[PDB]
Design a protein around this nucleic acid. Structure first.
Length: 468
DNA sequence: ATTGCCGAAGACGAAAAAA
DNA sequence: TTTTTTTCGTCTTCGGCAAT
C-alpha cells in the first residue's frame, strides 16, 4: 500500500480523500472491485476523479464509463471539468448518435440509457463507476442484468448508505464488483440472508468478513474526519421543471418579449421585474400563482427537497429551509408535515419577537422537531446553531458568510448547505454570471437584481428564457 | 409474521403529432 | 427533412389484501 499523490487534480484533497482515493486505486491495480461508501458530504465524486486522473497517467483510463442518476448528471459534468480540466469527457444522453465513444477518456450515462443502448453494452472499458449503486439492489431488476453484462478492467461502486447492514442490497453491488465472491443470489440468500435475517451472528460475522475488505466507509462524525471537513459544505442541487411549470415559464417568458419592445425607460425595468418575479415563483411551485392542490409532484424543487430530507433524516440531522416567499414558506411546511407526518415550525417576519424565539427554542430543544422553515430577508436575530443541514429553496439572499453569521450557521457544528437551482431556468444562467466573475461581476450585482433590468433585450433573452 | 398477486404511481425515454 | 410539444410505454417500487 502507499498514499498516491493527487495527479493534476485542480483542488486540495483532505487527508481522508487522499487515503480513500489511494486505497481505491491500490485495489484496482491489484485487480479488485471496491465500493466507496462515505457519507454524501465527504466527496466521493472528487476522490473518484483523483482515481481517474491517476489511472490516466498510468494509461489505464481511456475509455471509462460512469453510470449515474439523472439527478446528478451535471454534477459530474461540473466536477469533472473543474477538478480535472485535463480529462476529456462526453455526456451520453441525447443525440447519442453524434457521439463516438472511444474518442473520450470518460463517458457519463444514465441507468435509464443503459437499458436502451447497445453501443455501451459492447465496449472494452478500463473503468466503470456505478454512482449511487443502490440502483442495483434487486438483481431481479433489468438494470442489474444490463450492468453485469458490461466489460470492465476496473470497477467502483459508489453509495451513500451503509451496505454492511442491508443484507439484501449487498449481493448485487458486491457481485458486480467481484463476480462470485458470494455465489448466486439464490445460494447467497440461503447461507447468509434468511440465516442472518432469522437472527444469526455466525452468519453476519462471516459474511461481513468476506466483504469488509472491499467496502470502505467513513461517516461525517468519524473522529478521524469531523475536524478536517470544512464547517460549511455547499453543493448545488439541480432541479427539473414539471411539464406544468415549464408551460407557465415558457408562457411568461414569451410574453415579456412581446411587450418589452413596446416600452422603455422606467416601465421597461418594472415590466422585466414582475415578469422576473412571476418566474421566480413558477420555479418554486405553481400553486403560488394558480392556487390549487399544494402537491410535491407539481414542483421540481419539492421533488428534490424531499429526496434530500430523506437522506438528512437518515442521520438525525436538523434541517433548515430558507425561502424568499412567505407563501412558499407555508406550502413547504405543509407538504413536509403531511408527508413525513412530523412537526414543522415556520418562522417569518410578521411573527412577534416572542413568537420567533418560541420557535427557535422548539427547534434546538425538542428531540422530535427535526425541521424548521424560514421566510425572512437578512437583519434579525435567528439562532440556528442546531442546524447541520441547510436548504436554500430559492435564491433569497442579497448577493454570504456574513449572511450565514447573521444566523449562527457554521458556528457550532459542521453543516451541509444544499442550494437548489432549476436547470435551464434563469436560476442556472444567473450563476453562469456570478461564477462568470467576481472582479467585474459582483459590484453592481449587489444592487439587488436591478442590474438585470438594464441588460439588453437580446442578452436578457438568453438569460431568462428557458434553455434545454 | 411471511409471500405474492394486483393496482397505482412515479420516473424517463422514445415514439407520435403538429401552430 | 427540421423542430418542438404531447402523448405513449416500459420498468420498477410500494401500498394494500388475501392466503399460508
Amino acid at each position: 500500500f502507499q498514499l498516491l499523490e493527487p495527479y493534476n487534480i485542480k483542488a486540495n484533497l483532505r487527508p481522508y480523500q487522499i487515503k480513500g482515493f489511494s486505497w481505491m486505486r491500490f485495489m484496482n491495480k491489484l485487480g479488485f472491485g471496491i465500493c466507496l461508501a462515505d457519507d454524501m458530504g465527504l466527496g466521493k465524486t472528487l476522490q473518484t476523479i483523483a482515481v481517474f486522473s491517476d489511472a490516466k497517467k498510468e494509461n489505464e483510463l481511456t475509455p471509462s464509463l460512469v453510470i449515474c442518476p439523472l439527478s446528478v448528471l451535471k454534477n459530474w459534468e461540473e466536477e469533472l471539468s473543474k477538478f480535472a480540466p485535463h480529462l476529456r469527457f462526453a455526456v451520453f444522453h441525447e443525440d447519442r448518435s453524434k457521439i463516438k465513444l472511444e474518442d473520450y477518456d470518460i463517458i457519463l450515462t444514465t441507468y435509464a440509457v443503459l437499458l436502451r443502448d447497445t453501443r455501451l453494452k459492447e465496449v472494452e472499458w478500463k473503468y466503470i463507476v456505478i454512482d449511487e449503486a443502490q440502483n442495483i439492489k434487486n438483481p431481479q431488476t433489468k438494470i442489474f442484468k444490463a450492468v453485469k453484462e458490461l466489460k470492465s478492467k476496473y470497477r467502483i461502486a459508489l453509495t451513500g448508505t451503509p451496505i454492511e447492514n442491508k443484507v439484501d442490497d449487498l449481493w448485487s453491488i458486491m457481485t458486480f464488483l467481484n463476480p462470485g465472491l458470494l455465489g448466486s443470489y439464490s445460494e447467497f440468500k440461503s447461507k447468509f440472508a434468511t440465516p442472518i435475517k432469522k437472527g444469526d451472528n455466525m452468519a453476519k460475522e462471516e459474511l461481513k468478513a468476506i466483504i469488509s475488505p472491499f467496502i470502505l466507509r467513513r461517516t461525517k462524525y468519524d473522529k478521524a474526519i469531523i475536524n478536517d471537513l470544512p464547517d460549511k459544505i455547499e453543493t448545488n442541487v439541480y432541479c427539473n421543471l414539471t411539464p406544468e411549470q415549464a408551460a407557465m415559464y415558457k408562457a411568461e417568458v414569451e410574453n415579456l418579449f412581446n411587450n418589452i419592445d413596446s416600452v422603455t425607460g422606467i416601465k421597461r425595468k418594472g415590466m422585466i421585474l414582475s415578469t422576473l418575479l412571476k418566474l421566480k415563483q413558477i420555479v418554486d411551485h405553481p400553486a403560488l400563482l394558480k392556487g390549487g392542490e399544494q402537491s410535491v409532484r407539481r414542483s421540481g424543487k419539492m421533488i428534490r427537497t424531499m429526496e434530500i430530507i430523506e437522506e438528512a433524516l437518515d442521520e438525525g440531522d436538523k434541517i433548515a429551509i430558507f425561502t424568499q416567499f412567505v407563501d412558499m414558506g407555508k406550502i413547504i411546511r405543509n407538504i413536509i408535515e403531511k408527508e413525513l407526518n412530523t412537526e414543522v415550525p415556520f418562522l417569518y417576519g410578521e411573527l412577534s419577537k416572542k413568537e420567533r424565539d418560541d420557535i427557535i427554542s422548539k427547534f434546538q430543544n425538542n428531540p422530535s422537531v427535526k425541521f424548521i422553515v424560514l421566510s425572512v430577508k437578512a437583519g434579525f436575530g435567528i439562532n440556528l446553531t442546531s442546524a447541520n443541514r441547510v436548504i436554500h429553496f430559492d435564491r433569497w439572499w442579497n448577493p454570504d458568510q456574513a449572511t450565514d453569521r447573521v444566523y449562527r450557521i457554521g458556528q457550532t457544528r459542521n453543516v451541509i448547505v444544499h442550494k437548489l437551482i432549476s436547470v435551464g431556468t434563469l436560476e442556472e444562467k444567473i450563476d453562469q454570471l456570478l461564477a462568470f466573475k467576481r472582479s467585474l461581476f459582483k459590484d453592481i450585482i449587489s444592487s439587488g437584481d436591478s442590474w438585470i433590468t438594464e441588460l439588453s433585450t437580446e442578452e436578457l433573452r438568453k438569460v431568462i428564457e428557458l434553455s434545454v
